[PDB]
């Protein structure tokens, strides 16, 4: 164990008291100083760990890929003890999460086991793509949001804004974030302002971090007889300071006075930085003496940036303002366990475990939720990582691990495992402990084998009522699709083993085996899949693996009503299922996928919604049978049977088979074996005879599949490819190059706007996901490395052309024109699936 400030046994004592614990996830955009902030925290807690005078420490960048690339790839936990303004120690469980958008899933894996989200914003950049995405995700996960504005030195040493303009920039950042939260929420208690203590201003490179409370406490310590809580309620906004009355007035004393925040906080910071970086030899000792800072002779000989860091560490001291923010605005596990169970527990808060866990009882029934899987040093075994929502997990205690498929009716997906050693992760050394009480974060060994991605650990034979926690909902969709083979086919087994391990390391990774024996990996972007394949080649499998050129996963839709009442007759030739297919209204699929409307609703509310906004027949709205291919699937199966033709009792005994067959038929797809998206199936004529033996599930489900395909194929089917949303932060002269690059890739620019308070421009555009391969590299090359872009899956858009136009010739090495694209994309997909070339209506 490396030497720290606090006792390790004191940390274990802090473990028991759930009130003295905060579960905090540090999220934000790419390279907004999240890892450097944790570096500063580690330096504050660990005396013997210090940042190099030239290179960043990157304590939580523990993967070699992370160290070389410079981008955080996987979330890393640090459990530290931090003092607040009052000096009371707290146990902070911090999730240093990647800022790259392709690893948004990783952030989600930390947002499940976290009560509060500290969102880092670059002061020079502002609100970016991943910032907005994570605001939406954290609010919709019902988490307490606290914003922290990192890299405020860039406003001083790099942008050189006047302090009033720096205040305006910070105010703009805060107001924009508040607007974002208000857009995606209903509460008025989710408003952010440093007046309330929701915002810290920091520069993690120079170890600056302060709220208004901490700076007011610095003033109180240097002067005395100052209520720093009452003083910090006035260091923000248009409140000015009259020195005649020694008062704070909302009106301007003079005609050219400054804000209180500028006078008392920003201006001293500017002067500190200016005296350190410009007058280090002339007026620096006098300035430091005025601040009560004494540096040695060997410390004044340092370079300007190490000296700035040292000076700001002597002045500000410790990150007590950050701890104040996370204590006063992020609920403790005991306080915050009720909404967490309300949101992420299948049984809800109304069960006998929805209240035994909502109290966060350290000595109740053991219920832990593991959502991360961290590799061992060699890379053979794994350690699950998760939050102990109830009970006290012990080392050696056997537990019942429940997978995502465990339900009460079907209990096949469970296993009794032996908990090996338990660790507390501080991201580079694991404190091995004997037990972990509730409300904490724990590393568990031995239980990894039955865990695929997320698991619920409970007591064996303890709670037969114990359900599973809801599986992780990811912000984006795995779209990019690579195919992998072993170089030596005899080594195909080993690759499979490797393909399992990565499947545990990456929460959004979607590995599978297709019909033709292909091993297909689904990821979110080029960097995501590059890291996946680095880990699959170097870390786990340690073999030679060939990659295919990446493609995207298509979907299938309709554009017109099916010309014929497409009918299917069962093999017994007594049931006649006659349906049509037509597209849903614009945006209805978005409502279905976002859980705006749910199948769990009563028919009353569902019909009320579908009559309110979509103008249907209430008979048809009440008759909406199923959402496909899943409960959230953006496909609708509307029953359009007449009341006087097919009796409800005659049809209710066969509705279930029709529903399941429709679900799996839309899951498969008849064009190129892809999900059918945005389709409405009106069951017109369901001739079901009398005998219950002739209308069984094996009699209907394949017939349901057949009628679904027949209705689909006659409704002018079309291919739909995913479209990514791209934000480019480019200099003003490199916008024409961005336009030229996006022109070559079928991409159109939604907007190009200058960034307020920065010389840069933001170009927001839409680009086809199949055309976005190497788009970032091309954009950075064509703009001399200046235009940087992040790509995220946004929506689905119809591929140009008719997929079934069999009069289209395809030359195998030429980018086809748009009207042929849908014909091309289907055929080469089918050949990859191992299917027939032409789609025939006769099946």
């Amino acid at each position: 164990l490396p030497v720290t400030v606090y006792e390790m046994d004191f940390l274990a004592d802090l473990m028991d008291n759930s009130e003295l614990i905060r579960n905090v996830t540090l999220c934000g955009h790419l390279h907004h100083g999240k890892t450097c902030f944790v570096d500063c925290l580690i330096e504050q807690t660990h005396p013997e760990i210090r940042k190099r005078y030239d290179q960043d420490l990157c304590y939580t960048d523990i993967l070699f890929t992370e160290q070389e690339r410079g981008v955080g790839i996987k979330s890393t936990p640090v459990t530290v003890v931090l003092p607040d303004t009052k000096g009371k120690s707290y146990l902070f469980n911090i999730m240093d999460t990647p800022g790259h958008v392709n690893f948004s899933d990783e952030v989600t894996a930390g947002l499940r086991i976290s009560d509060g989200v500290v969102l880092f914003i670059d002061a020079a950049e502002g609100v970016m793509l991943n910032t907005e995405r994570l605001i939406k995700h954290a609010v919709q996960e019902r988490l307490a949001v606290t914003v922290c504005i990192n890299k405020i030195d860039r406003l001083i040493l790099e942008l050189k804004l006047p302090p009033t303009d720096a205040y305006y920039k910070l105010r703009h950042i805060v107001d924009e974030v508040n607007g974002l939260i208000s857009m995606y929420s209903t509460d008025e208690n989710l408003i952010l302002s440093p007046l309330l203590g929701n915002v810290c201003f920091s520069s993690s490179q120079y170890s600056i971090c302060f709220t208004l409370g901490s700076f007011a406490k610095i003033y109180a310590d240097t002067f005395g007889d100052i209520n720093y809580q009452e003083f910090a309620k006035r260091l923000w906004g248009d409140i000015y300071f009259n020195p005649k009355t020694r008062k704070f007035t909302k009106k301007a004393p003079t005609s050219s006075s400054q804000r209180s925040f500028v006078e008392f906080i920003l201006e001293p910071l500017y002067k500190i930085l200016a005296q350190v970086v410009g007058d280090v030899d002339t007026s620096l000792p006098r300035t430091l003496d005025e601040l009560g800072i004494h540096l040695t002779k060997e410390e004044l000989k340092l370079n300007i940036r190490p000296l700035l860091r040292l000076v700001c560490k002597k002045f500000f001291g410790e990150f007590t303002g950050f701890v104040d923010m996370c204590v006063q605005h992020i609920p403790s596990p005991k306080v915050g366990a009720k909404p967490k169970i309300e949101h992420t527990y299948t049984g809800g808060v109304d069960s006998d475990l929805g209240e035994a866990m909502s109290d966060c009882d350290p000595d109740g029934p053991l219920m832990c939720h593991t959502t991360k899987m961290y590799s061992t040093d060699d890379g053979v075994q794994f350690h699950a990582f998760g939050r102990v929502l109830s009970g006290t997990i012990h080392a050696g205690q056997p537990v019942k691990v429940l997978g995502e498929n465990y339900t009460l009716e079907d209990e096949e997906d469970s296993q009794i495992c032996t908990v090996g050693r338990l660790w507390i992760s501080v991201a580079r050394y694991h404190i091995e402990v004997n037990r972990v009480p509730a409300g904490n974060w724990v590393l568990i060994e031995g239980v990894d084998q039955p865990i695929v991605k997320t698991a619920t650990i409970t007591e064996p034979r303890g709670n037969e009522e114990a359900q599973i926690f809801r599986p992780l909902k990811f912000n984006t969709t795995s779209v990019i699709k690579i195919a992998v083979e072993p170089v030596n086919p005899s080594e195909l087994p080993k690759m499979l083993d490797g393909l399992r391990k990565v499947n545990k390391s990456y929460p959004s990774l979607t590995t599978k085996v297709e019909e033709s024996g292909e091993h297909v990996i689904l990821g979110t972007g080029e960097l995501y899949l590059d890291c996946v394949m680095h880990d699959l080649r170097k870390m786990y499998s340690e073999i030679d693996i060939k990659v295919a050129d990446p493609v995207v996963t298509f979907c299938e839709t309709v554009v017109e009503t099916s010309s014929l009442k497409c009918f299917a007759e069962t093999p017994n030739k007594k049931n006649k299922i006659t349906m049509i297919a037509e597209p849903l209204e614009k945006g209805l699929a978005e409502d279905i996928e976002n859980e705006v409307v749910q199948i769990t609703w009563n028919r009353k509310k569902l019909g009320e919604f579908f009559q309110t906004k979509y103008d249907w027949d209430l008979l048809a709205a009440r008759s909406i049978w199923a959402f496909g291919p899943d409960a959230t699937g953006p496909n609708i199966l509307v029953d359009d049977t007449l009341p006087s033709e097919v009796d409800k009792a005659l049809l209710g005994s066969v509705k279930d088979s029709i529903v399941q067959g429709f679900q799996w038929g839309t899951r498969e797809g008849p064009l190129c074996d892809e999900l059918i998206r945005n389709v409405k199936f009106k069951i017109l004529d369901a001739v079901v005879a009398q005998e219950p033996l002739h209308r069984g599930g094996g009699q209907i489900i394949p017939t349901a599949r057949r009628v679904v395909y027949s209705a689909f194929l006659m409704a002018t089917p079309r291919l739909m490819e995913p479209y990514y949303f791209v934000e480019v932060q480019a200099p003003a002269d490199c916008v024409s190059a961005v336009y030229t690059v996006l022109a070559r890739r079928r991409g159109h620019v939604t907007q190009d706007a200058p960034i307020p308070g920065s010389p840069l421009y933001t170009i927001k555009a839409f680009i086809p996901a199949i055309d976005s391969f190497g788009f970032e590299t091309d954009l950075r090359t064509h703009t001399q490395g200046q235009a940087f872009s992040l790509s995220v899956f946004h929506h689905w858009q119809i591929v140009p052309g008719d997929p079934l136009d069999k009069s289209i010739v395809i030359r195998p090495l030429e980018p086809q024109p748009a009207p042929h694209l849908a014909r091309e994309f289907m055929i080469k997909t089918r050949r990859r699936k191992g299917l027939s070339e032409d789609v025939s209506i006769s099946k």
Partner: protein, 473 residues
Amino acid sequence: DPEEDAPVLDWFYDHQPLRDSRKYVNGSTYQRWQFTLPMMSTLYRLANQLLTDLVDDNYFYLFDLKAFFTSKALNMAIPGGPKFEPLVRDINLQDEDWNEFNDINKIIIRQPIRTEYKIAFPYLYNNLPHHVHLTWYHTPNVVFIKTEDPDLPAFYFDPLINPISHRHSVKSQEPLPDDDEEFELPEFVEPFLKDTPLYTDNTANGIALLWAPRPFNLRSGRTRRALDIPLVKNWYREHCPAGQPVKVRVSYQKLLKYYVLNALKHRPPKAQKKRYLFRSFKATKFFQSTKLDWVEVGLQVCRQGYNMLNLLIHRKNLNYLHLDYNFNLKPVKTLTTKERKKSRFGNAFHLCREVLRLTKLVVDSHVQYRLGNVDAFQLADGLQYIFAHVGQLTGMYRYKYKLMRQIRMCKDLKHLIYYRFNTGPVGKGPGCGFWAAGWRVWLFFMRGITPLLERWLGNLLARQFEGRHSHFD
């Protein structure tokens, strides 16, 4: 300028500036230095011709050392990057034939997979990516703004910075029923640095020095040997300009190739005992110490080398041979075949002869400068010509042909400098005197040749004085 350049004016062109001043250097041994910010700013401004306008490493995307290592390990060359030989030869890259996994009719092509992609993400776009290096992904764009006017305040809202939008303030505090006295600070309470000004005249310069190339972002440091400063290393580390001829482009690529090879083959120096040659020599009674003009000691070295080779010749009784003072072996008369075979020296004698010829040329250019025949600008041009035309002035390439590698380099640098020099009002013709580039190359050549030549000449001189220093069946 006595006003602008005051911090450096009185010591700028001294041989070893500030050596006597203990405020700046440790002492006469000249190991450490510690300057002030105004001096650093003046030096940085005076050197702004040999430095880069880049404040960020983002310019070197797919053009840094890691990208080059990856491209070398993949037998691929980025546009403007160096070409190498393949690492893995005995695995044929076209031996992979049309199987069902690489089926052309199975893959969709809309945008060709350029070699830039295969190096940005080597594990995704390449099969068998052995010995590939992951390039640094991205550094946040430095938005530092260089100001070319000291009259501007160190802090000011630059017109380049885009303006910020209008007002918004949601502060719904309780409307106080005002019969009260509100918050008041103590009497002696004031902002932390009310006395100090917001910005002085050295603040903007220090901020600019933050975003400055090494060593101008330094405050102190260690002295380096004059040959260890390449001074043009960042010129071929950037992309070649647009309308350059083919020779200049290939010169950039070859300089880049040798930079990559030096960075890749670099091994840490080995631990060893501190052997010093000249300290041992001075410890004897046969060596004295003095302080001589460099031109004088150069003439002494030239004369000593001539005398020493001439003694080597006259020892073997070769009166028909004549070593001239430009170090040219000459036949006095038409020599018989028996005389020609007895006048056949090894590559040791001829390599020493040609090295002494180059030294004689350099020292003789300096002597021509000191005699007043040739002035300083033409002296620098002559040295630049000498160090870039060793293949023609001397002939050591025919006794150690590997040094042709140096010659090509000295030509490559000649291009790199010339097309940075002969731009604008400056055309072709002589005049460039930036001889540091080739001088470094020939010094580093001598660094490796010194042990080889010393061994060869030791063997030869020991031989002059009767000294030396189907298997299995």
